[PDB]
């Protein structure tokens, strides 16, 4: 039932995200003006953030379902929704202007933190996947699981190669957009290096089940990040599918996170904190130099974190 509750919370966030997306359209500018699109998106994102932060602080140090607060987490969906609407209306009551830039910087920091946390989660998920499938390779029919592992890793690497091809075709020119070339070349070379480090026998000796699969997954995620950094480039010479793909990967990570008297399966407080950071990140994404530099540094932090998770046992 706890997993069901986590999935339902993810569902409410997804519904709010879809609402934010739809108001982003030009047609809705007519309706909202009657009370721009980015302003309403900021308002709804602030509602998400404040609600989730409030619930997480409420859920502090809860350790058993015997807590009435555990029931509050489980039930009262209707009161949750009503309080959310009341908050969202309240957001409209805050004056515009300086609040816009304040929330923009708050959203930048939130998106950075969410990217970091989601990335740690992604590395953990990839490691668990690789270990489970190598174990099933050992115990059960070796051929089936070997074929599955090879197909998955090859698929991820081929998709990353296709993304590289598209980015070279679109965001680079023979004698132009040198920033695009720099970013793409650095990301590709560092991804190759990360793959190599994932095979070095000394590294595996300390992490026996660290293999190419998680490397390819990280490479695909890095390719997506770097692409996204380019699509927002203000310079049109160096400049929705990328954001849709990012939303898909975020949904996958949220589902992984989602998937009692003596102990709780997960800290509701920390889960809701992650949810709030997810709201901030989506708010940043759906929409400037900080976006570009944040995304590029996020890709580089991706590769650094993966390399660190692989190497730290060496130290």
């Amino acid at each position: 039932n706890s997993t069901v509750t986590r999935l339902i919370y993810a569902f409410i966030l997804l519904l709010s995200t879809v609402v934010s997306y739809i108001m982003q359209r030009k047609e809705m500018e007519t309706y909202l003006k009657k009370i721009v699109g980015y302003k309403a998106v900021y308002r709804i994102s602030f509602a998400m953030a404040i609600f989730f932060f409030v619930f997480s602080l409420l859920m502090f140090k809860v350790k058993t379902s015997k807590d009435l607060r555990a029931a509050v987490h489980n039930g009262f969906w209707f009161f949750k929704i009503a309080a959310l609407i009341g908050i969202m209306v309240g957001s409209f009551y805050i004056p515009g202007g300086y609040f816009s830039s304040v929330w923009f910087v708050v959203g930048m920091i939130g998106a950075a933190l969410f990217i970091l946390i989601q990335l740690v989660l992604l590395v953990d998920f990839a490691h668990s996947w690789n270990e489970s499938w190598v174990n099933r390779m050992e115990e059960g029919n070796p051929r089936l699981w070997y074929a599955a592992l090879l197909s998955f890793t090859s698929a991820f690497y081929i998709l990353s190669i296709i993304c590289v091809g598209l980015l070279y075709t679109y965001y680079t020119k023979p004698d132009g957009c040198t920033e695009n070339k720099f970013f793409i070349s650095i990301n590709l070379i560092l991804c190759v290096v990360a793959s190599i480090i994932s095979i070095h026998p000394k590294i595996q000796e300390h992490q026996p089940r660290s293999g190419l699969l998680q490397s390819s997954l990280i490479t695909l995620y890095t390719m997506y990040l770097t692409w996204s950094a380019m699509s927002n480039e203000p310079d049109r010479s160096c400049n929705d599918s990328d954001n849709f793909i990012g939303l898909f990967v975020f949904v996958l990570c949220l589902l992984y996170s989602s998937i009692e008297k003596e102990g709780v399966q997960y800290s509701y407080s920390l889960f809701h904190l992650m949810l709030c950071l997810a709201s901030l990140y989506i708010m940043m994404t759906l929409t400037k130099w900080p976006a570009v530099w944040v995304k590029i540094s996020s890709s580089w932090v991706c590769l650094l974190l993966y390399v660190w998770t692989l190497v730290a046992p060496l130290v």
Binding site: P142, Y146, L149, L150, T153, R209, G211, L212
Partner: peptide
């Protein structure tokens, strides 16, 4: 078992 440094990790399934 003859565990070996295979690409998919450090295992012995291929050489049990």
């Amino acid at each position: 078992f003859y565990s070996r440094y295979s690409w998919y990790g450090y295992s012995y399934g291929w050489s049990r």
